[PDB]
């Protein structure tokens, strides 16, 4: 079977924890910390391994960005250090083409990156790519017949509708349709053909709503909205299903984990996270 792991987060500072929800039984199980809190990271997998990327440890010691990029192999419970980025980066996004993580934008102190490198796992190298056209952190990143798509996020003055997309066998970003919402801090994952964009903050207010763009039409369309306004929520897809997972709702650090259903265009409550907080890495893999 397959577990939803959610890594790291922020409830008064950041987290180490790493633990896995089943959907097949509703059981969460707690495995090895991170060896350093972290917010504001991605989670993805790549080979059965789950990497943790990038992020903020927010300490009453002080708050340090992160380049790391740590790997977990369920097998052993055991996290391993990687290769670091070029850059820290807080509040990032990640995909993963052809067994290769891209990390894409986020923060260093006042720093907006625009900026973009790639992962090898069989070298263990960083190598950078070309930057994206817009600073984006907080931004959001899909992966959908290899190529790579950057949603949303904020720029370092204003939070955004915009959208592109990396073309890897040209090296070339460019613009997308923008969104039917301003979106930073969202949601942002694949489902069939489409690229889904769900809550986040528009400048103003935490979101509950949720649009998707289909790249065979290009138009963003809406779907019902989540249960729960929230921004800084973890997204995965775990057969066929979308979930998300905590975040904020500008008053409560939400537990609350909802399920979409496509079929039906409906979200419902699945679980509760042991413990309300935001700002998660998330991904899917293999049972320890
Ligand atoms: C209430 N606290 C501070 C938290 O919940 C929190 C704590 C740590 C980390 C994050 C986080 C994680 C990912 C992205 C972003 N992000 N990136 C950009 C913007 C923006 O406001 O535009 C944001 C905010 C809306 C979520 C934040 C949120
Ligand atoms: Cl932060």
Redesign the pocket.
């Known amino acids: 079977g397959r577990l939803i792991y959610t890594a790291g987060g922020?409830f008064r500072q950041s987290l180490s924890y790493l633990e896995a929800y089943n959907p097949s039984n509703g059981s969460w199980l707690r495995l090895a910390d991170l060896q350093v809190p972290r917010?504001?990271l991605a989670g993805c997998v790549v080979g059965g391994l789950l990497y943790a990327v990038g992020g903020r440890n927010?300490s009453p010691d002080g708050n340090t960005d992160s380049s790391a990029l740590d790997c977990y192999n369920p097998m052993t419970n055991q996290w391993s250090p990687c290769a670091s980025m070029s850059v820290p980066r807080n509040?990032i996004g990640v995909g993963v083409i052809d067994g290769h993580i891209y990390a894409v934008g986020g923060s260093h102190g006042c720093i907006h990156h625009s900026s973009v490198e790639r992962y090898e796992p069989e070298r263990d190298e960083w190598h950078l790519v070309a930057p994206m056209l817009t600073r984006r952190?907080?931004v959001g990143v899909a992966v959908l017949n290899r190529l790579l798509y950057a949603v949303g996020?904020?720029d370092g003055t204003n939070?955004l509708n915009s959208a592109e997309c990396y073309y890897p066998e040209r090296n070339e970003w460019r613009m997308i349709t923008p969104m039917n919402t301003i979106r930073?801090?969202a949601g942002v994952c694949v489902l069939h053909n489409c690229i889904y964009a769900a809550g986040?903050?528009d400048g103003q207010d935490q979101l509950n709503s949720v649009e998707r763009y289909d790249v065979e039409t290009e138009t963003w369309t809406f779907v019902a909205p989540m249960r729960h306004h929230r921004?800084?929520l973890g997204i995965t897809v775990h057969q066929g299903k979308i979930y998300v997972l905590g975040?904020?709702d500008g008053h409560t650090?939400l537990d609350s984990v909802e399920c979409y259903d496509p079929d039906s265009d409906t979200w419902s409550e699945v679980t509760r996270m042991t413990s309300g907080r935001?700002?998660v890495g998330v991904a899917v893999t293999m049972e320890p």
Do not use: H, L, Q
């Open positions: 922020y917010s504001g927010n509040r952190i907080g996020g904020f939070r930073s801090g986040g903050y921004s800084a975040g904020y650090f935001s700002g």
